[PDB]
DNA sequence: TCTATATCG
DNA sequence: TCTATATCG
């Protein structure tokens, strides 16, 4: 909050000034923030940390490899695909020199990050896998327009734009890199060890330029805060998502894999391959389906590559619907189904009130037009084409008996 | 939350009847929660999860063992003493009462041990495993309380005590609940960092009594949800009490004491200002700040405290021989005690001064003790607010 | 692998 | 061994 003595510190957790990045990045790099602040790219997220549903106080957006996807505090953010060698289509062509921005800059970060890695090591294929970023989270906030911002309970550090956390959603023992860009009453970041509350935390200070990398363990270690100054900031958090079951790619073949079972008549009623069966149609339906129709839209506005496949992903979970159906009627002895898939239809329940009230919730209700969240798939109990209701209990209740 | 199969349940949680309990018990201790209950020894606590203020909806007081406390949520309870073998206890109602809770204690520690020793298809883990030596006493009105949240995942409901963890026990622990519902209350379970897996609310009905055994508590989160009828509840734990007794905290200051001082090699001054943080911060304060309410029920740990009070006061006496005296390497071997000196007497100072701490009647009203202004002649040196911190900061 | 728990009027 | 966030700080 002074003028401190925080410059010595101690790398796990490195830090390099402005003076490190070629000055040709920074304008393009700051264009980028700049261009996608003012098309409008960048919202706040409607998470639900907890069972509460929460604004957050930084406005985000999740640029990367094309078909991943990032979930954090129980929202997935969709990738915007940046142009990763291989070509995609972007709304405006401003968005797409930007995320051409900022895929460069996830190169150089990562570079870096290789070689302070081999530096540390200082006491190897796991490491390229360690720095190999697949996405960024961009992150932008202006101080003065935040009517309230809370304040860090423990080392009164002033007010902070995140509260105490940890990067989630991360491969094992993988770093994160981070560019700050302070606009042209100062800006840090805080670390603590995570459980401890009598060891004085670290706020280093970030000036227009400087870029900072948590290495190995540190984010399992440490919580960290992003104190917040005077002016508004920038940011583009680079990580490596751990995306397996979190792509596109896997999504579909497990849908195809659940479709297999299926000539609406299914070839088999092994309890086991039923239970699979429905699971997998609880994830594509709430892990996918609900959480894009939920906040994903919004990127529509930046691209349109969630276009086709979430609708591909609608039919294929449309025909699982049918199986739910054929294998509810063949239940109309051996009751090992019955007790092989009542677990996934109750939690399909659970998570569709769930999600039905996120979306009509107070807060949600507090953002513009094309923002507010859309609960699709939804149906009424007059809808043919829908083989089964949106359930509501009466169907389980039933099954339960037993 | 409807009549259901769900008492179709698991191994590792066992739910008891009100008829396997004697009913001259059941009289007993439920003549001790209404006796508590008027006497007004049940209050509410400011609780500071991670950094918010907030007040428990539940009632509670802790009983137990004498010397021995239970932290939660950064909330350090002091247990009114039951009797086994010296007490003083305000009322001789009080007194009794805990003493039938003491009785429930080996009751639901005995009916524990069996079924912890029936589940095993070396011994003595067993028996320390279910020596509880506190009881943390818990009450409601639901009509009192208008909203209550409502269970967030399995549509259970409202809640008079959301999704947790016992903490501050001893590993592998059993816990055993007397629950005395005066529309059902239940009590909710489920595999702790799963969202997926549709939850276990099991109904409680008067006298009936449930304990969680082995990890039970650590693999699974528990919640209460409430019913329509006001509710009591006596939860016997055995808190992980070591680090949590007055004897612990006595000789540490003693050990703290053995140095106009002995000796200034670095280590030994370390930890000096250390056991200087620990009696301040984890003893003092807490008493103070919530402490002080049941001193309508007991008095024993006004005996105590104050001698804890004295001696700190001589460790700020060691402090003020340091500072004088400050080759500096007893500068980088005492800036993190300090400085962690200064923050939590910050963090307490703020919990004070909070609205909520300021709405409370005046027997509950927090203390910021100890304070003074720089005025007072007597403490040799001040309360911070930097200074000391920032000239030894330097290099 | 829950847990970043802020509509400041 | 944070994390039971139901009183605007
Ligand atoms: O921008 C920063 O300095 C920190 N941002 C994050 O911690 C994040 O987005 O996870
Ligand atoms: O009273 C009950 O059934 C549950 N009470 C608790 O979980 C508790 O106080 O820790
Ligand atoms: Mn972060
Ligand atoms: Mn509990």
Redesign the interface.
């Given at each position: 909050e002074f003028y401190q003595?925080w410059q010595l510190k101690y790398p796990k957790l490195i830090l390099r000034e402005a003076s490190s990045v070629s000055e040709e990045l920074h304008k393009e790099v700051q264009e980028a923030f700049l261009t996608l602040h003012k098309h409008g790219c960048l919202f706040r997220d409607l998470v639900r940390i907890?069972?509460?549903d929460l604004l957050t106080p930084v406005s985000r957006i999740l640029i990367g490899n094309p078909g991943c996807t990032y979930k954090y505090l129980n929202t997935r953010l969709f990738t915007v695909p940046w142009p990763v060698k291989g070509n995609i289509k972007h709304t405006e062509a401003e968005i797409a020199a930007a995320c051409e921005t900022f895929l460069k800059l996830n190169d150089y970060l990562q570079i870096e990050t290789i070689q302070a890695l081999e530096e540390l090591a200082a006491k190897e294929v796991d490491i390229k896998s360690r720095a190999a970023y697949n996405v960024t989270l961009l992150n932008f906030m202006d101080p003065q327009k935040m009517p309230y911002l809370k304040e860090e309970?423990?080392?009164?550090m002033g007010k902070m734009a995140v509260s105490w956390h940890h990067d989630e959603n991360l491969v094992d023992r993988s770093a994160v890199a981070v560019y700050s860009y302070s606009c042209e009453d100062i800006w840090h970041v805080g670390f603590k060890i995570s459980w401890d509350?009598?060891?004085?935390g670290l706020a280093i200070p970030l000036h227009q330029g400087d870029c900072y990398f948590m290495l190995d363990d540190l984010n399992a270690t440490h919580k960290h805060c992003v104190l917040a100054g005077s002016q508004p900031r920038f940011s583009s958090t680079h990580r490596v998502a751990e995306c397996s079951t979190g792509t596109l790619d896997y999504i579909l073949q497990r849908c195809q894999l659940a479709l297999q079972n299926v000539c609406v008549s299914l070839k088999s009623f092994e309890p086991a391959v039923l239970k699979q069966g429905e699971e997998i149609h609880?994830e594509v339906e709430f892990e996918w389906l609900r959480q894009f129709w939920f906040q994903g839209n919004r990127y529509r506005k930046c691209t349109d590559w969630w276009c086709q496949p979430m609708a591909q992903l609608e039919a294929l979970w449309k025909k699982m619907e049918g199986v739910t159906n054929a294998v509810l009627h063949e239940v109309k002895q051996r009751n090992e189904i019955l007790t092989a898939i009542l677990?996934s239809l109750?939690?399909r329940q659970?998570?569709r009130?769930?999600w039905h009230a996120r979306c009509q919730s107070r807060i949600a209700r507090t953002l513009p037009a094309d923002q507010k969240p859309e609960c699709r798939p939804y149906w009424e109990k007059d809808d043919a084409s829908m083989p089964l209701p949106f359930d509501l209990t009466d169907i389980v209740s039933e099954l339960?008996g037993q």
């Open positions: 003595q907890k069972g509460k309970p423990y080392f009164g509350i009598e060891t004085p609880n677990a109750t939690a659970n998570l009130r769930e339960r």
